[PDB]
């Protein structure tokens, strides 16, 4: 039959997923799990409990609170050939982590949309590793100062930042002055140079830390 091949292909793909350190898995058109390797089941609280066939509202991890929105993603992949990447920042079973979950349509020798495949990648450590690699390819900021500097390093001017944060330009100018002085820079251009050379382009404003998200990248 053809179902013979559609079950040989699926056991192929569990053998495939079972030998990667990344969280790998596939679920159905009901967003119900068909398989997930030991990495994925270990990122959720499912260390040794092998639970499968359930929804994203799994056992033993905070991920379940966004299970709903997971499945929503799981259907907008299914109505398309193209893949979609999800930034999942979550208090996983061993602390807060910044993952990328790439979700792709599941096609098989059927040719039918059977569900989705998801590939989770741990961005926390590799962000720093690739950052040191890429740049060798070539002070206590407050929260608002971190925001102002994030947008300064990204081509915005003081009036643009005033708009983005809903304060007056004088307020943002005062913030820039205090950032500049904390860097020891003599003017805005020296501030840009100092911040770019000290790794601050890769800084994430700490007000963003430890808040649970899952967002499709666009």
Ligand X SMILES: Cc1cnc(O)c(C)n1
Are 213 and 91 in contact by the 8 Å Cβ rule? The answer is: no
Are 101 and 118 in contact by the 8 Å Cβ rule? The answer is: yes
Query: Which residues in the 188-207 window bind a second copy by CB under 8 A?
Result: 189, 192, 196-205
Residue span 28-67 as binding mask against ligand X, x where in contact by CB under 6 A, dash where not: ----------------------------x------x----
Residue span 44-83 as binding mask against a second copy, x where in contact by CB under 8 A, dash where not: -------------------------------------xxx
In the complex with ligand X, the residue whose CB is nearer, 44 or 149, is 44
In the complex with ligand X, the residue whose CB is nearer, 86 or 148, is 86
For ligand X, which residue has the nearest CB? 70
At its nearest, how many Å lie between a second copy and the CB of residue 116?
12
- 101 near ligand X, judged by CB under 6 A: yes
Q: Are strands 115-122 and 213-216 parallel, antiparallel or unpaired?
A: unpaired
Residues facing 95 on adjacent strands: 92, 93
- 78 near ligand X, judged by CB under 6 A: no
- 154 near a second copy, judged by CB under 8 A: yes
Are 136 and 117 in contact by the 8 Å Cβ rule? The answer is: no
**CA-CA-CA-CA torsion sign (131, 137, 141, 147):** negative
Residue 16 binds which one of a second copy, ligand X, none, with CB within 5 to 8 A depending on kind? a second copy
What would the 3-class secondary structure string for 116-181 be? Answer: EEEEEEEHHHHHHHHHHHHHCCCCCCCHHHHHHHHHHCCCCCHHHHHHHHCCCHHHHHHHHHHHHH
């Amino acid at each position: 039959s053809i179902s013979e091949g559609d079950d040989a292909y699926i056991r192929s793909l569990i053998h495939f997923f079972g030998n990667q350190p990344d969280p790998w898995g596939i679920k159905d058109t009901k967003s119900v799990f068909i398989y997930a390797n030991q990495p994925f089941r270990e990122l959720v609280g499912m260390k040794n409990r092998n639970v499968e066939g359930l929804t994203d509202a799994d056992m033993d991890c905070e991920t379940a609170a966004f299970a709903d929105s997971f499945q929503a993603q799981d259907r907008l992949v299914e109505q398309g050939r193209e893949k979609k990447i999800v930034l999942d920042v979550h208090p996983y079973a061993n602390g807060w982590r910044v993952f990328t979950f790439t979700k792709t349509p599941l096609i098989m020798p059927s040719g039918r949309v059977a569900g989705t495949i998801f590939h989770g990648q741990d961005l926390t450590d590799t962000a720093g590793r690739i950052e040191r690699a890429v740049v060798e390819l070539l002070l206590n900021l407050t929260e608002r100062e971190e925001l102002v500097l994030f947008f300064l390093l990204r081509g915005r001017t003081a009036k643009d930042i005033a708009g983005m944060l809903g304060r007056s330009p004088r307020t943002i100018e005062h913030a820039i002055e205090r950032i500049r002085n904390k860097f020891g820079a003599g003017n805005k251009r020296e501030l840009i140079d100092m911040a770019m050379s000290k790794g601050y382009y890769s800084m994430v404003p700490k007000a963003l830390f430890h808040t649970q998200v899952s967002m499709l990248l666009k």
